[PDB]
């Protein structure tokens, strides 16, 4: 995940992140929280979470037997709703 | 009410289709024939909203096949040990049920003429071997139970009505195949295309069928006592072998025209499965039909004589 | 470009690797050529993955398969040239669709899982 | 072959009988002409 | 009841574990429902190639043919399952069901059963877990299973 | 025009044969077992009956050499030949011209 | 070609976009102004670690099968 800070154009633009074993499918932000929390999904079976500053892995989210092709975050950031080649929507509480 | 009646009906076909044969569940079984008549009237005069109805048939008709097959296996499960050769000699469940009702009619020459008229699908030789089994096997003793006689009469009724429903779907699809699968229609014919799609259910599924298995679709069940080998040498027979595209060319080429023909039918049905319902072009099946014509005329024309 | 419709389509390098696996499994008898035998492998479910051809015409006859591949959840790619594909399958006549099947005793199994993994990368 | 075949099903395992009639139904060939024998016994067979 | 995701999970579970028999058991059940029933005998052949004629797979063959009403074929497959593994009890259950429908004499089967003393299988273990059949003779266990 | 035999005639004559086999109490001939007692000797009789023609001519043609080759392979491998024979009796309904 | 099209329908909309993104740029950056003005390390870092701990403590809640093929698009509606 290439996190580009475009507020600084000539210095420290990119903060690179190592997301998933295989490629990255969808990336989302914590929305109403004012960002500061990111959530990413990819063809690795894990859905992982990040912060807007450290940009590090806080934890890995299991629950997908197979590829994770889509992800979306609740506006209030409480619950996560995703879908994948498992052909089933999933929640996180 | 079609959308109200139909899902519950398909659910019923799932229930009894899941019910194993030799376990009768007669009360639950008789509840199908009201839904059979219901689907007959929904099908016959409605002629409205086909586009929604096509996937519904693609769903139900395989369940209809497994269901009539189930009634067949349960029915022979009823006739077991009384006249066991009847399944081996009579392949079809329709011929099976009707001919059985005829053996249980009891009401000689009127019998030989009567199963020929009522069954109507029985060839002379089939009648011959059937009569052989009547002498060497059929017990001609009164049935074990009159309640068993009423049970098998009921099974005859539900199997007959169910087959009439399948044939009705075959006629309705037979009407709409022009817009359904235009390539297969132009390539073979409306009736035979309707029989292929009818036996294979969804056009998607008939595209999921390889070209090698299409030739045997519709083939009367292979029977070791019946003769097979023909001068054309074709062992598949079946629907497509009865098409004009084959039968117009000489006896030597029927085999190659059968293999090539089944291939082009598979490809054509795959194109029709890929195309939207609104925009369809027959040009592919057209140039393929031209190619098959070239193949048949080349295989028909022998090689020119060599200089001695 | 080899048609607007057909997707995904690999590059020259990955195409080279995939065709290498095509010839290899073809030497191990783990491959099934043709659209009909590809369909049979998909229905049986023993297919590791599906290769198809971009330059083939018409494209629809190869476009019936991707629906079946997405049904069985099996990966598939499009090599650009059917001539190169069948040439890799060991047939002079150009082949459109080939299928790498499953063998638990196969020595190339790891190669098939690697190439298959890159295919799943392409699928999207 | 139908009557004959049943009469053989009386004698032998119907596998053997169906083999017999299946062998009596073949493509008979002479020079540049070919047909099938549907009707009548083929004498050249050993079990004939 | 929806067998689509079941088929998917079977395919993936075979990709990870082709050798295990129980997966081919559940798949043979899926194709036993007959939503397709196009590829069937070839799926039995594949199950016998992968599982190498496992008694569970053979049993599932005899249960599928049991749902095809043919007690000669299903009886044959159940007997083959006996020869592979005797101590597996579901074989005996589906036996006494098939002999119950066809009508053959079961006495020798009771003899080989008392010689067998089978405890194995999901249905049999379930019988032991029903707590009413906890301590009782295997004969009346079978009687209550039928 | 179909088979000349009518179901009435077939009924009568087949009833005659069945009534005869029942009156004589004739046990039907079983398919040859996997292991049959006189099996090898029966195979010998067949092969010798086939070699009866070829013991004479000193000059064999191609087809005769193929047949005699088959027969010699039948002496060399009776188990493989007998199993090849039982396979055809159980299976093939389609034969070469 | 570079800068070739006129796009008449665009200019009327594009000026609505310079007004729109202009005012929401000033308003948004003003919210940022109040935020960076009023934060501090204590409830900033503690709340941050709290939320991150929550996400790290999330676990699969439920799942619902939908379609015969995989589910490509998953989007939560507003609220």
Curated annotation (Swiss-Prot), chain A:
GO terms for cellular component: nucleus; spliceosomal complex; U4 snRNP; U4/U6 snRNP; U4/U6 x U5 tri-snRNP complex. Involved in RNA splicing. Is required for the association of U4/U6 snRNP with U5 snRNP in an early step of spliceosome assembly. It comes from Saccharomyces cerevisiae (strain ATCC 204508 / S288c). This is U4/U6 small nuclear ribonucleoprotein PRP4. Transmembrane segments: none annotated. Keywords: mRNA processing, mRNA splicing, Nucleus, Repeat, Spliceosome, WD repeat. Component of the U4/U6-U5 tri-snRNP complex composed of the U4, U6 and U5 snRNAs and at least PRP3, PRP4, PRP6, PRP8, PRP18, PRP31, PRP38, SNU13, SNU23, SNU66, SNU114, SPP381, SMB1, SMD1, SMD2, SMD3, SMX2, SMX3, LSM2, LSM3, LSM4, LSM5, LSM6, LSM7, LSM8, BRR2 and DIB1. The gene is PRP4. Disulfide bonds: none annotated. The keyword Repeat applies. WD repeats lie at residues 19-60, 63-92. One of its GO terms (molecular function) is U4 snRNA binding. It is found in: Nucleus. Present with 1770 molecules/cell in log phase SD medium. One of its GO terms (biological process) is mRNA splicing, via spliceosome. Its main location: nucleus.
Curated annotation (Swiss-Prot), chain B:
This is Pre-mRNA-processing factor 31. One of its GO terms (cellular component) is precatalytic spliceosome. Component of the U4/U6-U5 tri-snRNP complex composed of the U4, U6 and U5 snRNAs and at least PRP3, PRP4, PRP6, PRP8, PRP18, PRP31, PRP38, SNU13, SNU23, SNU66, SNU114, SPP381, SMB1, SMD1, SMD2, SMD3, SMX2, SMX3, LSM2, LSM3, LSM4, LSM5, LSM6, LSM7, LSM8, BRR2 and DIB1. Interacts with the snRNP via the Nop domain. The coiled coil domain is formed by two non-contiguous helices. The record marks 212 as: Interaction with U4 snRNA. GO terms for biological process: mRNA splicing, via spliceosome; spliceosomal snRNP assembly; spliceosomal tri-snRNP complex assembly. It comes from Saccharomyces cerevisiae (strain ATCC 204508 / S288c). Promotes the association of the U4/U6.U5 tri-snRNP particle with pre-spliceosomes to form the mature spliceosomal complex. It is found in: Nucleus. Keywords: Coiled coil, mRNA processing, mRNA splicing, Nucleus, Ribonucleoprotein, RNA-binding, Spliceosome. One of its GO terms (molecular function) is RNA binding. Residues 180-301 form the Nop domain.
From Swiss-Prot, chain C:
The keyword RNA-binding applies. Keywords: mRNA processing, mRNA splicing, Nucleus, Ribonucleoprotein, Ribosome biogenesis, RNA-binding, rRNA processing, Spliceosome. One of its GO terms (molecular function) is U4 snRNA binding. One of its GO terms (cellular component) is small-subunit processome. It is found in: Nucleus, Nucleolus. Transmembrane segments: none annotated. InterPro entries: eL8/uL1-like, H/ACA_rnp_Nhp2-like, Ribosomal_eL30-like_sf, Ribosomal_eL8-like_CS, Ribosomal_eL8/eL30/eS12/Gad45, Ribosomal_eL8/Nhp2. Its main location: nucleus. Changing residue 79 to L: Impairs binding to U4 snRNA, but not U3 snoRNA, and causes pre rRNA processing defects and an accumulation of unspliced U3 snoRNA. Changing residue 57 to A: Impairs binding to U4 snRNA, but not U3 snoRNA. Causes pre-mRNA splicing and pre-rRNA processing defects. PROSITE patterns: RIBOSOMAL_L7AE. Signal peptide: none annotated. One of its GO terms (biological process) is spliceosomal complex assembly. Common component of the spliceosome and rRNA processing machinery. In association with the spliceosomal U4/U6.U5 tri-snRNP particle, required for splicing of pre-mRNA. In association with box C/D snoRNPs, required for processing of pre-ribosomal RNA (rRNA) and site-specific 2'-O-methylation of substrate RNAs. Essential for the accumulation and stability of U4 snRNA, U6 snRNA, and box C/D snoRNAs. Belongs to the eukaryotic ribosomal protein eL8 family. This is 13 kDa ribonucleoprotein-associated protein. It comes from Saccharomyces cerevisiae (strain ATCC 204508 / S288c).
From Swiss-Prot, chain F:
It is found in: Nucleus. Present with 468 molecules/cell in log phase SD medium. Component of the U4/U6-U5 tri-snRNP complex composed of the U4, U6 and U5 snRNAs and at least PRP3, PRP4, PRP6, PRP8, PRP18, PRP31, PRP38, SNU13, SNU23, SNU66, SNU114, SPP381, SMB1, SMD1, SMD2, SMD3, SMX2, SMX3, LSM2, LSM3, LSM4, LSM5, LSM6, LSM7, LSM8, BRR2 and DIB1. Functions as a scaffold that mediates the ordered assembly of spliceosomal proteins and snRNAs. Required for association of BRR2 with the spliceosomal U5 snRNP, and the subsequent assembly of the U4/U6-U5 tri-snRNP complex. Functions as a scaffold that positions spliceosomal U2, U5 and U6 snRNAs at splice sites on pre-mRNA substrates, so that splicing can occur. Interacts with both the 5' and the 3' splice site, as well as the branch region. Has a role in branch site-3' splice site selection. Associates with the branch site-3' splice 3'-exon region. Also has a role in cell cycle. This is Pre-mRNA-splicing factor 8. It comes from Saccharomyces cerevisiae (strain ATCC 204508 / S288c). The lineage of its organism: Eukaryota, Fungi, Dikarya, Ascomycota, Saccharomycotina.
């Amino acid at each position: 995940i290439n996190v580009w800070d475009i507020r600084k154009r000539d210095e420290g633009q990119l903060n690179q992140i190592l997301a998933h074993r295989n490629i990255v499918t969808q990336v989302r932000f914590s929305k109403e929280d004012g960002g500061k929390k990111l959530v990413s999904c990819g063809y690795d079976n894990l859905i992982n979470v990040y912060s807007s500053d450290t940009w590090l892995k806080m934890g890995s989210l299991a629950g997908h037997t197979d590829k994770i092709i889509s992800l979306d975050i609740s506006n209030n950031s409480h619950f996560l709703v995703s879908g994948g080649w498992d052909r089933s929507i999933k929640l996180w509480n | 009410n079609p959308f109200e009646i139909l899902p519950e009906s398909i659910e019923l076909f799932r229930t009894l289709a899941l019910i194993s044969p030799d376990r009768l569940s007669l009360s639950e079984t008789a509840q199908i024939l009201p839904k059979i008549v219901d689907l007959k009237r929904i099908l016959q005069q409605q002629e409205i909203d086909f586009i929604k109805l096509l996937p519904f048939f693609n769903e139900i008709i395989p369940l209809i096949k497994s269901n009539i097959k189930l009634m067949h296996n349960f029915l022979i499960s009823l006739y077991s040990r009384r006249f066991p050769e009847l399944s081996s000699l009579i392949p079809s469940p329709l011929q099976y049920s009707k001919v059985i009702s005829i053996l249980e009619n009891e009401n000689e020459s009127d019998e030989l003429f009567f199963h020929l008229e009522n069954k109507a699908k029985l060839t002379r030789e089939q009648i011959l071997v059937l009569t052989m089994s009547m002498k060497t096997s059929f017990k001609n003793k009164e049935p074990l139970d009159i309640k068993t006689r009423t049970q098998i009469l009921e099974a005859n009724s539900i199997l007959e009505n169910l087959w009439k429903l399948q044939e009705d779907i075959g006629q309705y699809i037979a009407s709409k195949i022009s817009i359904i699968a235009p390539n297969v229609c132009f390539l073979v014919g409306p009736e035979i295309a309707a029989q292929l799609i009818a036996h294979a259910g969804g056009v998607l599924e008939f595209s999921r069928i390889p070209s090698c298995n299409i030739a045997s679709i519709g083939k009367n069940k292979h029977l070791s006592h019946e003769l097979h080998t023909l001068e054309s040498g074709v062992r598949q027979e079946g629907y497509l072998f009865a098409s004009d595209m084959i039968q117009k060319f000489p006896v030597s080429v029927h085999k190659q025209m059968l293999r090539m023909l089944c291939a082009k039918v598979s490809l054509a049905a795959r194109v029709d499965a890929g195309q939207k319902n609104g925009d369809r072009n027959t040009v592919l099946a057209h140039k393929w039909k031209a190619e098959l014509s070239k193949k048949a005329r080349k295989l028909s024309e022998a090689p020119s004589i060599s200089e001695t | 470009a080899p048609n607007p419709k057909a997707f995904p389509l690999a590059d020259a390098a990955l195409t080279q690797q995939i065709l290498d696996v095509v010839q290899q499994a073809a030497n191990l008898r783990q491959l099934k050529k043709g659209a009909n035998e590809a369909t049979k492998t998909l229905n049986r479910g023993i297919s590791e993955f599906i290769i198809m051809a971009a330059d083939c015409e018409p494209i629809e006859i190869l476009l019936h398969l991707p629906l079946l591949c997405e049904d069985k959840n099996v990966p598939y790619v499009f090599v650009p040239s059917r001539v190169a594909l069948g040439r890799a399958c060991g047939v002079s006549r150009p082949v459109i669709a080939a299928s790498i099947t499953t063998n638990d005793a196969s020595a190339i199994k790891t190669q098939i899982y690697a190439v298959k993994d890159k295919i799943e990368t392409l699928l999207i | 072959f139908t009557l004959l075949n049943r009469l053989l099903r009386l004698i032998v395992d119907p596998n053997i009988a169906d083999y017999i009639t299946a062998k009596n139904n073949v493509v008979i060939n002479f020079k540049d002409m070919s047909h099938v024998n549907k009707y009548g016994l083929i004498r050249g067979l050993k079990f004939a | 009841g929806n067998l689509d995701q079941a088929e998917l999970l079977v395919t993936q579970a075979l990709q990870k574990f082709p050798s295990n028999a129980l997966l081919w058991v559940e798949q043979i059940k899926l194709f036993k429902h007959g939503n397709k029933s196009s590829l069937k005998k070839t799926i039995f052949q594949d199950a016998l190639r992968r599982t190498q004629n496992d008694h569970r797979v053979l049993l599932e063959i005899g249960v599928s043919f049991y749902a095809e009403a043919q007690y000669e074929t299903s009886l044959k497959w159940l007997e083959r399952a006996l020869k592979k593994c005797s101590r597996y009890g579901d074989t005996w259950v589906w036996l006494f069901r098939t002999y119950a429908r066809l009508g053959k004499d079961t006495v020798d089967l009771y003899n080989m059963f008392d010689q067998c003393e089978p405890t194995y299988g999901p249905e049999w273990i379930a019988a032991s877990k029903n707590v009413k059949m906890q301590y009782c003779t295997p004969r009346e266990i079978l009687l209550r299973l039928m | 025009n179909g088979p000349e035999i009518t179901p009435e005639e077939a009924t009568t004559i087949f009833s005659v044969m069945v009534e005869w086999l029942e009156s004589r109490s004739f046990s039907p001939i079983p398919f040859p077992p996997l292991t049959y007692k006189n099996d090898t000797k029966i195979l010998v009789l067949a092969l010798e009956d086939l070699k009866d023609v070829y013991a004479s001519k000193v000059r064999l043609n191609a087809s005769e050499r193929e047949e005699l080759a088959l027969i010699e392979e039948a002496y060399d491998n009776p188990h493989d030949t007998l199993n090849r024979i039982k396979k055809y009796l159980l299976t093939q309904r389609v034969f070469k011209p | 070609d570079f800068f070739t099209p006129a796009t008449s329908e665009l200019i009327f909309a594009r000026r609505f976009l310079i007004n729109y993104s202009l005012e929401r740029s000033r308003k948004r950056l003003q919210k940022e102004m109040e935020r960076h003005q009023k934060f501090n390390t204590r409830q900033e870092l503690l709340s941050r670690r709290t939320e991150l701990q929550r996400m790290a403590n999330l676990e699969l809640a439920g799942s619902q099968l939908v379609s015969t093929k995989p589910i490509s698009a998953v989007s939560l509606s507003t609220d």
